[PDB]
Design a protein around this ligand. Structure first.
Ligand SMILES: C=C(C)[C@]12C[C@@H](C)[C@@]34O[C@](Cc5ccccc5)(O[C@@H]1[C@@H]3C=C(COC(=O)Cc1ccc(O)c(OC)c1)C[C@]1(O)C(=O)C(C)=C[C@@H]41)O2
Ligand SMILES: C=C(C)[C@]12C[C@@H](C)[C@@]34O[C@](Cc5ccccc5)(O[C@@H]1[C@@H]3C=C(COC(=O)Cc1ccc(O)c(OC)c1)C[C@]1(O)C(=O)C(C)=C[C@@H]41)O2
Ligand code: NA
Ligand code: NA
Ligand code: NA
Lengths: 446, 75, 446, 446, 446, 75
């Protein structure tokens, strides 16, 4: 019996929970069942089962993080006659500590529906072991070789182009004209032509980023609940694009406020450069730490601090009546007290001075010594919590970066395949030959 | 050019005549004209009375800093 | 032999110390003894034995934290013909990994003397497993379902009402009249009517909290030694009520000092809003951390810091004689030095200046670098100590919140029972049927 | 063969290294040797062997930290007919979990040469288990009962007397006359008589502390190498006494500089009050942590910081030539920069300003961010290191406090013994009776 | 078969990976191979085979970190008749726990190509066991004796001389003449002669350090990739020499800017004195924590901080147009904000003030609270990382310090050999005697 | 009584005539008299010249804050 046409292998992928004994259970069942199916009806491929979502059992295993299934289903190796057309791994050369294994490469690069990499790297950040799933030998070495071969030429080139764009934007912004009421009529001097060119390039960059963000949001379809947990970088780039467009709209509307928009874009224009530090072995950690601290910490501490700030602010402002002249100024003053920059003068001529002093001393003790250092202790725990995972984290930062680039590929090339339509495998119940884009990989393990 | 009295300053414009007008810090700065420094009115405390707990002292003397202050003429 | 009429089960509850083999021994003795009692005199219930404190073996096991006993006595399950009327756990449907067990829930909701929940949640903060004892399946799931069913609507409603009350109080306080000598005669303008309404609502809230606090203190009877270790929240709310009442008393006494009281109440009126953050899965920890730090840490560090401050303060004040003009001002100055806000000017005209400098440098080195960072290390230790246990603590903080509300409930209905006078158990030595308010719970465990 | 007349038991104390199997070895050797000695020459006691240091095997085991030997030799329990006079432990009543043992307490309180307490508590801070050696039952119970019985009334009384002395000293110091050229002629007003009385009491206290310190130094005879590692408190009290005496000497010498001495004494007069917080279960930690940090940390960090301070100070002072007018002022300014209190103004009119700025920025980065937080990390390590173990240290803090007081006791009674010349032991190869100052202790252990 | 003429012992050293069973395998192979070689061709020594790098199997094992091979090959002990000339360890006196072993010492001090000391202590900080490999007994005792015997008399003396030099230099700096346009004509007063003498001594020191640094760089040949990982101290001393030489060159060129060079040298002249702090058991650690923290931390954090600084700096400078009058001043102001020294004044007359405030508050929150404390937590992790390894670390500091000194020896001394051409070993396949400079060492181990 | 010129001040005594004498901060304060404010002498840099790296500018012009300053007329 089944629910939606699921095969027994499908139900077993669902049931498996990465326990060692359950792993052996499902592994042995898969071995026997696949052998029997190969012998009974060697007429068509059955692993590409359709479904309501079109999900294969290996695709489901990738989606749910059932690493135990992936460890075996992608590593079948057998030579028993009448069932030799379902093997995925082979061997050609062998030595004591080193073996030159031959791996099948289908369902990874070009499956046309949902490859293995296309699900592990695009998971919803609930899978407990997505950082380890890419450590399996075929995927790990494929990503390593794709990185070494051609990807770097595109990544470093992108980084250089972005840096040039930001330098040009900064230069154009610095030299804006001072007289009021835009738009301004250019003179025939060379400086005006350079400034106009800089502005045009800046707006072009802004428009480009806007459309890239639109495409990403339409294709990915975020949930609106995990919108900010993932896809942080696209959100920030898109926000920059919005600010730039608002700035140009105000510019052509004959208002002076466009500068107030522009500088905000300019600030992010530099800051988002930290994105490109992902993918470096060492310097990448200082990006992910900022992301975690700024999302999953301060959105909680915000309310706890704000209660204290607002309560004491209204207390002080209503106590003194006749520099604390308004609610805003007092909010700023107490904020300055919080971070140790403020000063306690105690000038004359306030009535109720003796109570004012007690309130301020209570506030300073409560906020500066007690609460703030509590926040610091929590952040210290957060950063120490991911000192050790840094290697595996970096691997994810590598992998996703590749998958966006090779998907885009920018030159109408088709060099993604590793090597060959190798016919040396050629196993099939028919008399014909076949290939699987096989990859020779040396494993040194003893 | 600058903004006039009652107009919003500090978002794109400053107000003129700093000796006449100032732009307050309230997140919506409507600049306003100054006011004269009026002298101290009645109900100020006199010498020897407790000051700082319910009322300030008159302009002729100071209220020291202590837990229970008493005003004294400056000498 | 016995002390105060205690049964053998009672003495075994006393003796039990939560060791595994002692648990096995005591449980086996309970099984044999209860079966013997059912065989000998199946005429009346003996589990509800009275005592000088009126504690049943279940009640005593709950009070003393004998978790090993509660693991058993609340889950008795046996098939002994003619003696099946003392079982608590049953089964109706059963599958491989999942079983739909039927749990007896009598004496938990309406025992009329002292329920199990009324002891675990109201313990004196000496029981070591009070945060874990509520994790047993019957109680745990009962509380979960009671929360999900109806309690949330009351809790969020309470939170909203309190927030409105505080907003109204702040608005009324901000717009107080400036002229002296209260009480003030209202004018026929609308603003005066709104202000009077705000004041009336504020005083009503103050009175209500006063009476709620008095009722709690009379019902609970704290020891006066653990008065502040538990019941922190009622203490703070009551303190607010006292300040509000003092304020109104001064207001009608034709004194203008009432504002000095009112603002203090206003400050607490915001701050203890943090109480309602308890019960949230994540944001609740920032309340209990503050409670622990402010009680069990600074009441010890206070002595050391005060000794240093007072010693150096008197030294400086007696050294210079002829701004450090008095003991109070110098105490404030050295306090400012402690938290890095002060400044070292070294003006002219002090005699013995060369000694004054040495004293100040010794003080700064002793307090700012050495002592304060020691305090910070201890607070960091405290914060990391309860990063983990907070989850279980949150469960406790959930449970107590329910028990106050459900017991009160303020609508005189009786919808708190889970379901049914279920007769399917119906076990008794007589020919009659019976019910125990049983609850069907699916356990998924394999 | 032997070195200095040492017995075989003595050599076994020397050889024992607290290993479990060596403990069994020396234990069995002691059992057999003691039995043989009892059988061979039951004529005189042989345990009180003389030596060059006058150490018995018990005394040497206590001195060297051979806890394994103390674990047995103080609790010998055996039934060997005709040789029952070597047992130290006996029994009168016995139950299942609780036994009312009878412990020999001789040679612990009045041995007249060197008791176990008199070397365990007076060790040179190299003994590895001195914090645990007092946990052996007879010692632990002696100390606990002596504390509960009478010692507290003396300790709290001492604390109160010292507090009164310091209050009187502060009051006398505050009201010193202002006119110059001491000594000053008193007037017949009451205030002068009170002031003179206060001064006389203060000097008397100073003299008393001076003589107590001298007596301690003569009796203890410290090494001059571990002078400051132990005996910190006597050193500080003695320093106070010296400052007070110098102050009075200057006072009668017709010089006005005496105040410069007096205030220093006054400062320590308060600070040393922290000594009396030792012996409290909770608040005692804040004394030992300060002692350890101020001795075994900053005497190392001092030189490393001073190199930076002096180097940059001379660099800045020689760079600018024509407020940094002298070496002293510049040293102070850079010190202010170290602890975040200073300010970077960069005024005009210095030549070489562009290099001055680079030097200061290098200094601020090197000292404030980098070095100081290194020091803070080390102190955090120290504080967390002894957060736990110092519970055992509190026991030491108890024990030494008793041993100084009971030794003096200031009432010329001899009520320190626990109870009785109990004759119920009465074991001897002769026909006579005897007592060992035995005490009955109930041990509950199962 | 072989690659480059390597012996079987060479291949075994290469293959060994410090596993226990691989250690046993290689050990037994060495035992059998050595016995066979002694029996087959007792005509010449074959263990000391050269290679392209000139590395013997002992030398290669030392170079590659094959500690397991050093554990055996340095301590061969065997009684094989007719083949006893391959033993390195012997015995003369023996007792129960203590044995007076006799160790061969050849090829450690005078091998004339590449001693074990010359590669174990000169590793590239990639060897995993370099901190432990010198803990093998013969090397450890050699270094301990060399330290105690004669080496100290040099090292302390060296330290003193350096300190004296710096003092003179400081004086020579302080009293420079004030009038402009060097060089200055001396007067016949004594002060001028002292100043000229001081200057001459200072320049001599600078030249000496320059040539020592050049000699080191030519002899060592650093890779230019690990140039700064090792050899930090020579780099700093050489930099000092360069600054001094530039200073004197400008001095004779009739320019006033020489002082700008000189003070920089003066600063380092003090600062790097911490090099001599290495070699102390306790005070040495405070040097190493600097070396890592300034190299392997801030060269990473630099770019992350600079992005924020530059972005916000340009944003603020372009927002306000008409003290923030230039990019440099604004960069300084925001830097002052970063370390809590700055002030938020909010003066009048800036247009767009309402946006200026928001930018500054965002910057303060982003840098001061969030980023900086992240840096501090990482440094805390680094500091605690090497609190424990200090005992090993200092040993390395000892060893290298000896090897540079004794090799240099500075006085034509030849005291490095322990004692004697001891003939008591005298084992050889010939009938002759022989010596191995053996060392008698008492080992106490049971 | 106060201390006279050349005597050690601030250890038990202050010096008189603060308008004439001051007690310096050198850890041994020998009290000293003030000096006249002499004007700027020669060798000061002029407008357009680099200032702050080897010489200051004359009293009639100012030296801004930047990595390579150039002096300008004070306005
Ligand atoms: C997520 C949003 C919408 C965000 C947008 C603005 C307002 C932002 O502040 C925050 C909230 C904030 C508020 C106050 C202080 C700091 C941060 O975080 C980002 C946003 C956060 C930052 C700081 O975050 C970064 O370090 C950028 C970054 C780090 C790591 C990345 O992988 C990354 O991906 C591209 C980007 C940059 C700002 O855009 C900026 O330059 C200013 C002035 C404010 C920052 O809001
Ligand atoms: C490595 C190089 C070339 C170095 C040379 C100069 C510029 C240096 O700053 C650094 C970088 C720097 C920049 C800003 C602030 C701090 C450090 O580190 C050293 C260099 C680093 C230091 C500080 O490092 C030390 O503590 C010295 C030291 C520690 C341990 C050692 O074993 C040691 O070996 C001799 C030397 C001293 C300076 O030379 C100095 O006195 C000033 C003003 C700057 C320091 O550059
Ligand atoms: Na600070
Ligand atoms: Na920390
Ligand atoms: Na400040």
């Amino acid at each position: 019996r089944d629910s939606v046409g699921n095969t027994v292998l499908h139900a077993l992928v669902e049931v498996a929970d990465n326990t060692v004994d359950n792993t052996k259970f499902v592994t042995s069942m898969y071995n026997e069942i696949l052998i029997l199916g190969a012998k009974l009806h060697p007429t068509l491929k059955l692993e590409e089962i359709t479904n309501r979502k079109g999900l294969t059992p290996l695709a489901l295993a990738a989606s749910s993080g059932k690493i135990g299934v992936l460890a075996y289903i992608l590593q079948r190796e057998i030579h028993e006659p009448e069932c030799r057309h379902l093997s995925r791994k082979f061997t050609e050369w062998a030595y004591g500590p080193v073996h030159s294994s031959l791996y099948d490469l289908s369902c990874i690069d070009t499956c046309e529906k949902n490859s293995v990499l296309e699900v592990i790297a695009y998971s919803s950040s609930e899978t407990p072991n997505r950082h380890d799933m890419l450590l399996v030998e075929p995927l790990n070495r494929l990503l390593q070789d794709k990185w070494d071969r051609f990807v770097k030429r595109i990544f470093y080139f992108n980084f250089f182009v972005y840096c040039l764009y930001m330098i040009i934007f900064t230069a154009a912004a610095y030299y804006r004209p001072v007289e009021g009421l835009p738009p301004y009529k250019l003179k025939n001097t060379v400086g005006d032509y350079f400034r106009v060119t800089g502005e045009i390039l800046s707006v072009s960059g802004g428009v480009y980023f806007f459309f890239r963000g639109i495409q990403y949001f339409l294709q990915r379809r975020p949930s609106l609940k995990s919108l900010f947990v993932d896809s942080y970088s696209e959100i920030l780039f898109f926000v920059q694009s919005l600010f730039m467009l608002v700035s140009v709209v105000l510019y052509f509307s004959q208002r002076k406020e466009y500068v107030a928009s522009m500088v905000f874009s300019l600030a992010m224009g530099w800051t988002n450069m930290l994105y490109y530090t992902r993918g470096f072995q060492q310097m990448g950690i200082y990006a992910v730490m900022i992301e975690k601290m700024i999302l999953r910490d301060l959105c909680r501490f915000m309310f706890v601090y704000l209660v204290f700030l607002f309560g004491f602010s209204t207390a002080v402002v209503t106590l003194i009546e006749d520099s604390y002249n308004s609610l805003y100024s007092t909010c700023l003053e107490l904020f300055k007290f919080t971070i140790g920059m403020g000063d306690l003068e105690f000038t004359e001529n306030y009535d109720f001075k003796a109570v004012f002093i007690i309130l301020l001393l209570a506030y300073v003790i409560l906020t500066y010594i007690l609460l703030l250092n509590m926040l610091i202790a929590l952040m210290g725990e957060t950063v120490n919590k991911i000192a050790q995972e840094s290697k595996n984290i970096w691997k994810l930062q590598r992998a996703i970066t590749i998958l966006d680039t090779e998907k885009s590929f920018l030159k109408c090339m088709r060099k993604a395949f590793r090597s060959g339509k190798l016919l040396q495998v050629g196993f099939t119940p028919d008399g014909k030959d076949d290939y699987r884009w096989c990859f020779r990989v040396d494993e040194v393990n003893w | 050019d600058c903004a006039k009295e009652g107009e919003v300053c500090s978002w794109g414009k400053k107000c003129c005549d700093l000796d006449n007008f100032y732009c307050p810090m309230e997140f919506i700065p409507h600049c306003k004209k100054y006011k004269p420094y009026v002298p101290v009115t009645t109900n100020c405390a006199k010498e020897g009375e407790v000051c700082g707990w319910g009322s300030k002292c008159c302009h002729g003397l100071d209220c020291p800093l202590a837990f229970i202050p008493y005003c004294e003429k400056y000498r």
